[PDB]
């Protein structure tokens, strides 16, 4: 049936009877000897359908001639047997029964509606106590549960003026008595009666549930099951096994238990069994229904085997093995196979080799499609036989069929889209799949026995889509960043490095070659060496600004290898790229440059030719590796012999008591580290110096042709950290607790490691292996969360028309910059007109894409901050505008309308998740940001600001260094001084926080008493002490309310006033303070009154996206103004923030042990830090704005990848951020029909406010709410996507009671229901449908 929406709601019992075709009565299915289905059972023929294909069970009719008629020998209706899997039945329970889901969801829906605790409703339902209903003229409330002894009281104290039922009957009577709308009105007016938010929130939840039930056609008693439908039998087959036995079926046994119990209850109720017996039977029946529905939510699951609990309906719905993730989202497909791959170097970039047998077994029908068309076979019957005969003509048919038919290859797992690609197949004799070398990088495919699967696209559109989107040559750029995925392989780069290298003296040196071709001849005639230095006439073509090549020819000083390689580089590049010894880095840009100039078609053939030449000349190289090539520097034995001795000296101090325990350790380890550095440097120097050659006279050194050195230098394999362990020393190691081993592994793998050294190495080896094995799961879970939170977003519009955006600046932290501006802003469109450095002059138009040329133009100027449009700020409803997203990183142009950016971004973020771990510097100009500072006695600039940051701008006018300076620091280099690198810029006390005054004047211990607020310490070191201020915890109110104060005093009654300020120079003391300037002491400006003494990898980002609150929440101040204290710390301290104007009495509780950045009079603003530590993304969004929280998220998730060397385009993160805060909470209901306070989807609230403001009525006011991905994925308005993700047993009830309806918008739902996705070609089809409407 054609459909356009899916609706979910509660099922009324008469609706269930409408579903059913019969009532199952006998709990029997089939005979244990004959295989006929027993009538009126779980497999009744006349209820669900006949078992035979087109014949009735009774055998009266066996033809289509009697189709649709009803037999009277057995009662079964004869029709297509398939209908047997669609017809349902129903069991009419002898007594009502509560639906387990609605009883025990995350809240209790049945409990919430009646406002009755879940424990008490369960106690009633399981026949433990009575509950009085319609109590009438009795002192018994509306529900007022009462026990049997209490009931025994009411039985005689009152007569029949009260009613107290037990079990589901009482709950059904209560539901049937629910005056829903009147109750909701009364409660929505009672909400205003009290301000108890602790109860107001759950009251809002209750009224929301009541409104959802009122609006929906659902009725309360429908939460209590009365008729239980039975699943169609063909969906729960009782399949036989080897021998005369049938395989056990989980659902069948649960239904059998329910039917038997219910029949027993009916039998008793007919025979008038005593109340105790009928109550026990009813409880057993209720518990049996519980086991049938959601087995496991009971006290204990039932089982019929060695404690293997039986799977229930709810068990089959959800779960990793459930339908959603087992058969709908991912399903096994025909026309597919798998095999072990191997490398075929002869293949082109766009080809792959497949076995003849696999080709025949996948393209079988296509072969038939020729056998009839060729007329060589009569029909399928002979065509299949001929194919079996593997006739030599059939191989010609296969060679014709497979001519231009792509095949899809994908390796498991496939983290990113580059793991699935289309290839043009070629037949191969063997059984392994021939894969291309350059492609193996994309698959992460090591050829050490790696299996890979092939899928055959059948239809025409599938073939075209494969060839146009998934072909190998269409995926040369990585979608995660502007980096080619055809990066040259490990072996090829070795060949190119060997070919283009130059030696001092070599055969055929110094002559003149008339052209590259001749050079090649010389090598192949053996007259010249490949590394010989020679002058060859080179000719190069350069395309003009218009785009036509200009030929220029010249003499060039170069090498024979480079001249040979130049015969492969296309006719558009300068010779300087090949005039250098190429390595895995140097070659890569080369290839990239081709795509920058020539285009895709020249680039692919150039890559293939590079691979061919590299393989050939690497084979000619014969760069073997042997034990003779691992060089131990001779000085190493000395470097050890000295270093150990130094440790001995560090030991001697410990042998003399001249050092502490820890200092000995941290000196020994540092000395060993220095020795290791010396050993490594000597080893590297020896490796490069091992080559010295005679150039016609006198020895001369040069770069080393050592095999290991060429392998390392070319970047193929074995970097410096590898050669250091192979030829230097293994170095230090760490214990499983991470402690540095005092005795390093002073050996290297060329020499033998001893038993203890190997055992030490095993610690780190197993730690790394366990890290990999454990992180491989968290990475995948993060990928799933990302895809299920971002599956909705598609580029569905050209321009949204907005003008906002985000400003991009180079990352300057820890001094020098860590990344340039070009990387951030490349490929985005400008937000507003870009101004020339200076004033009144613009440089780029307001909505122009900043491609490579404009990025170079900006880098030419001194532009550091550029505002560009971002996907988070785009104002497009239920989609994302194309202009914000900007460049498609895999194409280079602007992103097309219809691309699924969400899944691409999720894969881009999640692919490197398996690479993480689960366990002044230069001269410039001084700039001060947020730095309010005062002049001390000496006139130095000492900071009076706590958010002070130090920014340094070089001579060419851009900031290159950034620093943060805490409160109380003295700025030696300030007022825009120019200071050279390494010259101390500022000074600080690294241990304690000092407190300083503004004026110079006398002081007293105002309102302070010895013993009450200060301790008469002695300072045993000298006997003259600095008084220690008593804490709030160490003293009672006699010292807490007597807060220490060091207010500056003068004879005039006031201090020298700052213009416009009336505040006296009042200063105070917090706890743990150490104060020297006692009474009668003159404190000058800038004098320190007193002093107060005092991370991760993958989880650091996983909790960041989930927006988990920090264990140590750095409290940010809100509003603005000047802070204050309230009452002191008892239980936990209380403080108050007083703005200049507005609501002065704003208070907030504060932890005692967290030191405060403000004490009593510090000017404060929204977001001002009161304590150190990580912030809260929720608080940041609430206090500093959407742009601020987006910047925080992007930077704190990029700091994880930058540390590990992974590069991901920042935009790929912002999309996920767009998903986190897709919801908003209403501030004022306004003219909108929205609730007074409610969280509504931001798109809906925005469209409603747009139309409302168009009509001039009061639009709603809202705060965008940052939801972590794990919750926001389940918070969508389409219940199918949420229930397909997790907590299905919860969502399938929350949406059920609400009468939810799905419009099937999004990708996952359309994939589930088997229609075209709203993306790509599917988006094109949907867009055509909507425009033609």
Partner DNA sequence: GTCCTATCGATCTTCGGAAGAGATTCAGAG
Partner DNA sequence: CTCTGAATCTCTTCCCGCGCGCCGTAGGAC
**Residue 741: CA count within 13 A, CB half-sphere:** 18
Minimum distance from residue 1305 beta carbon to other proteins (Å): 14
Q: How many Å apart are CA 492 and CA 440, to the nearest integer?
A: 13
The binder of DNA chosen from 199, 517, 543, 836 (CB under 7 A) = 199
Site membership for other proteins, residue 1323 (CB under 8 A): yes
The entry of other proteins, Zn ion, DNA, none near residue 1271 (CB within 5 to 8 angstroms by kind) is: DNA
- Give me the residue label for tokens 């035979």: 52
The entry of other proteins, Zn ion, DNA, none near residue 32 (CB within 5 to 8 angstroms by kind) is: DNA
Looking at the Cβ atoms of 11 and 1114, the one nearer to other proteins is 11
Binding segment toward DNA, per CB under 7 A, in 622-630, 775-783, 1173-1181, 1207-1215: 775-783
Looking at the Cβ atoms of 27 and 898, the one nearer to DNA is 27
Summarize the annotated binding site for Zn(2+) as residue ranges.
56, 58, 71, 74, 800, 874, 881, 884
Site membership for Zn ion, residue 794 (CB under 5 A): no
Q: Which residues contact 17 (CB under 8 A, 6 or more apart)?
A: 90, 227
Q: Which residues contact 429 (CB under 8 A, 6 or more apart)?
A: 355, 356
**Secondary structure (H, E, C), 713-743:** HCCCCCCHHHHHHHHCCCECCECCCCCECCC
Minimum distance from residue 1146 beta carbon to DNA (Å): 14
Q: How many Å apart are CA 872 and CA 493, to the nearest integer?
A: 42
The entry of other proteins, Zn ion, DNA, none near residue 781 (CB within 5 to 8 angstroms by kind) is: DNA
Looking at the Cβ atoms of 637 and 1109, the one nearer to DNA is 1109
Site membership for other proteins, residue 787 (CB under 8 A): yes
Q: Cis bond leading into 71, ω under 30°? A: no
Q: How many Å apart are CA 1146 and CA 70, to the nearest integer?
A: 80
Binding segment toward DNA, per CB under 7 A, in 302-310, 541-549, 734-742, 1030-1038: 302-310
Given a contact cutoff of 8 angstroms between Cβ atoms, the answer to whether 794 and 812 are in contact is no
- Give me the residue label for tokens 């059998």: 256
Give the footprint of Zn ion on residues 59-98 (CB under 5 A): 60, 71, 74, 76
Site membership for DNA, residue 262 (CB under 7 A): no
Minimum distance from residue 1306 beta carbon to Zn ion (Å): 20
| Long-range contacts, stretch 240-247, CB < 8 angstroms, 24+ apart | 240/35, 244/33, 246/30
- Give me the residue label for tokens 């909108």: 1232
Q: Cis bond leading into 413, ω under 30°? A: yes
Site membership for Zn ion, residue 800 (CB under 5 A): yes
Minimum distance from residue 1107 beta carbon to DNA (Å): 8
Given a contact cutoff of 8 angstroms between Cβ atoms, the answer to whether 55 and 81 are in contact is no
Given a contact cutoff of 8 angstroms between Cβ atoms, the answer to whether 417 and 411 are in contact is no
Minimum distance from residue 304 beta carbon to other proteins (Å): 20
Looking at the Cβ atoms of 257 and 436, the one nearer to DNA is 257
Looking at the Cβ atoms of 52 and 784, the one nearer to DNA is 784
Site membership for DNA, residue 196 (CB under 7 A): yes
Residue 289, helix vs strand vs coil: helix
- Total residues binding DNA (CB under 7 A): 53
CA Rg value for the chain: 40
The binder of DNA chosen from 217, 330, 365, 736 (CB under 7 A) = 330
Site membership for DNA, residue 1036 (CB under 7 A): no
The binder of DNA chosen from 118, 214, 268, 427 (CB under 7 A) = 118
Looking at the Cβ atoms of 50 and 614, the one nearer to Zn ion is 50
Give the footprint of DNA on residues 1283-1322 (CB under 7 A): 1286-1290
Give the footprint of DNA on residues 1252-1281 (CB under 7 A): 1268, 1271
Looking at the Cβ atoms of 389 and 620, the one nearer to other proteins is 389
Helix 901-910, helix 755-790: angle, nearest 10: 170
Given a contact cutoff of 8 angstroms between Cβ atoms, the answer to whether 1310 and 1318 are in contact is yes
Measured distance between the N- and C-terminal CA atoms of the chain, rounded to whole angstroms: 22
Q: How many Å apart are CA 1028 and CA 1035, to the nearest integer?
A: 13
| CA 109, 110, 113, 117 torsion-angle sign | negative
Looking at the Cβ atoms of 110 and 727, the one nearer to DNA is 110
Given a contact cutoff of 8 angstroms between Cβ atoms, the answer to whether 404 and 410 are in contact is no
The number of beta carbons lying within 10 Å of the beta carbon of residue 688 is 14
The binder of other proteins chosen from 17, 188, 202, 236 (CB under 8 A) = 236
H or E segment at 1226?
strand 1223-1228
Site membership for DNA, residue 321 (CB under 7 A): no
Task: Characterise 1306 by phi-psi region: left (phi > 0), alpha (psi -120 to 50), beta (else).
Answer: left
- Give me the residue label for tokens 């309230």: 1126
Q: How many Å apart are CA 947 and CA 1117, to the nearest integer?
A: 13
The binder of DNA chosen from 64, 70, 247, 340 (CB under 7 A) = 247
Site membership for DNA, residue 182 (CB under 7 A): no
Minimum distance from residue 1261 beta carbon to DNA (Å): 24
Site membership for Zn ion, residue 894 (CB under 5 A): no
The entry of Zn ion, DNA, other proteins, none near residue 71 (CB within 5 to 8 angstroms by kind) is: Zn ion
Which of 119, 126, 73, 68 has the alpha carbon at shortest distance from 97? 126
Give the footprint of other proteins on residues 1264-1293 (CB under 8 A): 1292
Give the footprint of DNA on residues 1069-1108 (CB under 7 A): 1103, 1106, 1108
Q: Which residues pair with 634 in a beta bridge?
A: none
Q: Which residues contact 598 (CB under 8 A, 6 or more apart)?
A: 570, 572, 573, 606
The DSSP code sequence of 503-524 is -SS-TT-S-EESSHHHHHHHHH
Give the per-residue contact string, 852-891, with Zn ion (x = CB under 5 A; - = no): ----------------------x------x--x-------
The DSSP code sequence of 981-1001 is TTS--EE--SSEEEEE-SS-E
H or E segment at 783?
helix 755-790
Minimum distance from residue 1142 beta carbon to DNA (Å): 22
Looking at the Cβ atoms of 850 and 881, the one nearer to Zn ion is 881
Give the footprint of DNA on residues 1201-1220 (CB under 7 A): none
Looking at the Cβ atoms of 882 and 1029, the one nearer to other proteins is 882
Q: How many Å apart are CA 1327 and CA 796, to the nearest integer?
A: 9
Site membership for DNA, residue 780 (CB under 7 A): yes
Given a contact cutoff of 8 angstroms between Cβ atoms, the answer to whether 881 and 795 are in contact is yes
Looking at the Cβ atoms of 85 and 1004, the one nearer to other proteins is 85
Which of 1049, 1050, 1032, 1043 has the alpha carbon at shortest distance from 1009? 1043
Looking at the Cβ atoms of 463 and 1084, the one nearer to other proteins is 463
Site membership for DNA, residue 574 (CB under 7 A): no
Site membership for Zn ion, residue 708 (CB under 5 A): no
Summarize the annotated binding site as residue ranges.
56, 58, 71, 74, 446, 448, 450, 800, 874, 881, 884
Minimum distance from residue 1268 beta carbon to DNA (Å): 7
Give the footprint of other proteins on residues 51-110 (CB under 8 A): 85-86, 88, 99, 101-102
Minimum distance from residue 779 beta carbon to DNA (Å): 7
The entry of Zn ion, other proteins, DNA, none near residue 884 (CB within 5 to 8 angstroms by kind) is: Zn ion
Q: Which residues pair with 423 in a beta bridge?
A: 407
Which residues form the interface with Zn ion (CB under 5 A)?
56-58, 60, 71, 74, 76, 800, 874, 881, 884
Which residues form the interface with DNA (CB under 7 A)?
32-33, 106-108, 117-119, 195-199, 247-248, 256-257, 260, 280, 297, 302, 304-305, 307, 318, 320, 325, 330, 332, 338, 412-413, 451, 776-777, 779-781, 784, 1103, 1106, 1108-1109, 1130-1131, 1149, 1268, 1271, 1286-1290
């Amino acid at each position: 049936e054609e459909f356009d929406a899916i609706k979910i709601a509660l099922a009324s019992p008469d609706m269930i009877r409408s579903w059913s075709f019969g009532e199952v009565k006998k709990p029997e299915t089939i005979n244990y000897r004959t295989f006929k289905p027993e009538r009126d059972g779980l497999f009744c023929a006349r209820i669900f359908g006949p078992v035979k294909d087109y014949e009735c069970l009774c055998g009266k009719y066996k033809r289509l001639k009697h189709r649709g008629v009803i037999c009277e020998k057995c009662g079964v209706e004869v029709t297509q047997t398939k209908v047997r899997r669609e017809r349902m039945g129903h069991i009419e329970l002898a007594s009502p029964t509560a639906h387990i889901w609605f009883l025990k969801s995350l809240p209790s829906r049945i409990g919430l509606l009646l406002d009755m605790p879940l424990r008490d409703i369960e106690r009633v339902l399981y026949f433990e106590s009575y509950v009085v209903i319609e109590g009438g003229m009795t002192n018994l409330e509306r529900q007022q549960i009462l026990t049997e002894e209490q009931y025994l009281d009411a039985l005689e104290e009152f007569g029949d003026e009260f009613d107290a039922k037990m079990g589901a009957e009482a709950i059904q009577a209560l539901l049937k008595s629910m005056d829903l709308e009147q109750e909701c009105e009364q409660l929505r007016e009672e909400l205003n009666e009290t301000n108890s938010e602790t109860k107001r929130k759950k009251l809002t939840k209750r009224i929301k549930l009541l409104e959802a039930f009122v609006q929906s056609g659902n009725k309360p008693e429908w939460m209590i099951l009365t008729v239980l439908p039975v699943l169609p039998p063909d969906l729960r087959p009782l399949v036989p096994l080897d021998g005369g036995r049938f395989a056990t079926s989980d659902l069948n046994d649960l239904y059998r238990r329910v039917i038997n119990r219910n029949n027993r209850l009916k039998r008793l109720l007919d025979l008038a069994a005593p109340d105790i017996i009928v109550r026990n039977e009813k409880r057993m029946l209720q518990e049996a229904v519980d086991a049938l529905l959601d087995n496991g939510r009971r006290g204990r699951a039932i089982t019929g085997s060695n404690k293997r609990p039986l799977k229930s309906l709810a068990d089959m719905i959800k779960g990793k093995q459930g339908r959603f993730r087992q058969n709908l989202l991912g399903k096994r497909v025909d026309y597919s196979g798998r095999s072990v791959i191997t490398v075929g170097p002869y293949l082109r970039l766009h080809q792959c080799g497949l076995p003849k047998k696999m080709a025949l077994e996948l393209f079988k029908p296509f072969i038939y499609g020729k056998l009839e068309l060729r007329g060589l076979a009569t029909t399928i019957k002979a065509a299949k036989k001929m194919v079996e005969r593997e006739e030599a003509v059939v191989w010609d048919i296969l060679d014709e069929v497979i001519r231009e038919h792509p095949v899809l290859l994908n390796r498991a797992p496939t983290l990113h889209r580059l793991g699935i690609q289309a290839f043009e197949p070629v037949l191969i004799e063997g059984k392994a799949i021939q894969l291309h070398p350059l492609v193996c990088a994309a698959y992460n495919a090591d050829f050490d026995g790696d299996q890979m699967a092939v899928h055959v696209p059948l239809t025409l559109e599938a073939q075209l889509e494969a060839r146009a989107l998934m072909m190998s040559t269409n995926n040369i750029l990585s979608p995660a960043n502007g980096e080619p995925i055809i990066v040259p392989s490990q072996d090829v780069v070795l060949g190119l490095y060997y070919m283009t290298r130059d030696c001092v003296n070599a055969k055929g040196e110094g002559m003149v070659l008339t052209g590259p071709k001749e050079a090649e001849r010389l090598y192949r005639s053996g007259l010249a060496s490949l590394h010989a230095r020679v002058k060859v006439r080179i000719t190069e073509y350069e395309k003009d600004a218009n785009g036509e090549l200009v030929a220029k020819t010249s003499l060039k000083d170069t090498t024979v290898g480079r001249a040979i390689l130049w015969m492969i580089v296309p006719k558009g590049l300068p010779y300087s790229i090949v005039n250098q010894a190429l390595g895995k880095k140097a070659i890569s840009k080369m290839l990239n440059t081709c795509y920058r100039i020539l285009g895709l078609k020249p680039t692919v053939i150039f890559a293939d030719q590079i691979m061919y030449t590299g393989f050939a000349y690497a084979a000619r190289s014969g760069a073997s590796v042997g034990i003779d090539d691992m060089v131990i520097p001779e000085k190493k034995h000395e470097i050890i012999s000295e270093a150990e001795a130094e440790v001995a000296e560090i030991q001697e101090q410990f042998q003399s008591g001249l050092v502490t325990a820890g200092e000995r350790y941290n000196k020994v380890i540092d000395i060993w580290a220095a020795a290791n550095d010396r050993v490594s440097k000597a080893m590297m120097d020896n490796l490069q110096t091992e080559t010295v050659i005679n150039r016609d006279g006198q020895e001369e050194k040069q770069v080393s042709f050592n095999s290991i050195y060429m392998m390392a230098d070319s970047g193929a394999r074995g970097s410096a950290a590898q050669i250091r362990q192979l030829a230097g020393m293994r170095g230090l190691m760490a214990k499983p607790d991470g402690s540095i081993i005092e005795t390093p592994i002073t050996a290297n793998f060329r020499e033998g490691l001893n038993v203890l050294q190997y055992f030490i190495s095993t610690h780190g080896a197993r730690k790394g292996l366990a890290d990999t094995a454990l992180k491989t799961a968290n990475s995948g879970y993060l990928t799933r969360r990302l895809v299920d939170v971002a599956q909705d977003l598609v580029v569905t519009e050209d321009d949204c028309g907005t003008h906002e955006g985000i400003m991009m600046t180079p990352v300057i932290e820890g001094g020098d910059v860590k990344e340039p501006l070009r990387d951030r802003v490349l490929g985005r469109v400008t937000a507003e007109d870009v101004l020339k450095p200076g004033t009144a002059d613009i440089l780029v138009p307001r909505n122009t894409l900043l491609h490579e040329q404009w990025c170079d133009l900006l880098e030419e100027n001194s532009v550091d901050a550029v505002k560009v449009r971002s996907v988070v700020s785009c104002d497009t409803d239920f989609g994302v505008c194309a202009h914000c997203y900007g460049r498609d990183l895999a194409r280079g142009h602007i992103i097309n309308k219809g691309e699924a950016i969400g899944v691409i971004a999720a894969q881009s973020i999640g692919e490197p998740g398996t690479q993480l771990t689960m366990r002044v510097k230069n001269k410039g100009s001084i700039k001060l940001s947020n730095v309010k500072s005062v002049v001390n006695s000496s006139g130095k600039l000492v900071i009076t600001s706590r958010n002070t940051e130090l920014k340094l701008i070089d001579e060419f006018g851009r900031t290159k260094e950034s620093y943060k300076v805490p409160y109380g620091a003295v700025l030696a280099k300030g007022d825009g001084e120019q200071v050279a690198g390494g010259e101390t810029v500022a000074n600080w006390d690294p241990h304690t926080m000092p407190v300083i005054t503004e004026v110079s004047g006398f002081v007293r211990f105002t309102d302070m008493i010895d013993g009450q607020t200060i301790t008469r310490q002695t300072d045993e070191l000298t006997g003259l002490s600095s008084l220690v201020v008593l804490d709030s915890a160490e003293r009672t109110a006699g010292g807490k309310d007597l807060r220490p104060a060091l207010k500056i005093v003068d004879a005039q009654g006031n201090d020298v006033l700052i213009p416009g300020t009336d505040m006296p120079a009042q200063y105070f003391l917090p706890g743990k303070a150490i104060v020297q300037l006692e009474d009668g002491v003159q404190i000058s400006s800038g004098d320190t009154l007193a002093r107060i003494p005092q991370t991760g990898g993958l989880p650091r980002v996983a909790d960041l996206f989930e927006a988990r609150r920090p264990k140590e929440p750095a409290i940010l101040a809100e509003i603005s103004g000047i802070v204050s204290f309230g009452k002191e710390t008892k239980g936990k301290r209380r403080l108050v923030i007083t703005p200049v104007d507005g609501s002065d009495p704003y208070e907030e509780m504060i932890p005692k042990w967290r030191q405060l950045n403000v004490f009593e009079g510090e000017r404060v603003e929204r977001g001002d830090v009161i304590s150190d530590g990580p912030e809260a993304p929720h608080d940041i969004l609430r206090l500093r704005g959407v742009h601020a929280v987006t910047r925080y998220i992007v930077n704190e998730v990029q700091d994880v990848y930058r540390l590990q060397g992974v590069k991901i385009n920042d935009k790929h993160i912002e999309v996920i951020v767009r998903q986190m805060l897709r919801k908003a909470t209403i501030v004022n209901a306004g003219s909108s029909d929205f609730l007074e306070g409610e969280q509504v989807e931001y798109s809906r609230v925005k469209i409603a406010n747009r139309e409302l403001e168009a009509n001039g009525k009061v639009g709603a006011t809202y705060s965008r709410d940052l939801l972590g991905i794990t919750k926001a994925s389940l918070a969508t308005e389409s219940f199918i996507s949420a229930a397909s993700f997790q907590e299905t047993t919860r969502v399938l009830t929350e949406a059920a009671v609400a009468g939810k309806r799905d419009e099937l918008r999004g990708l996952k739902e359309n994939v589930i229901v088997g229609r075209l996705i709203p993306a790509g070609t599917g988006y094109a089809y949907h867009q055509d449908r909507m425009r033609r409407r």
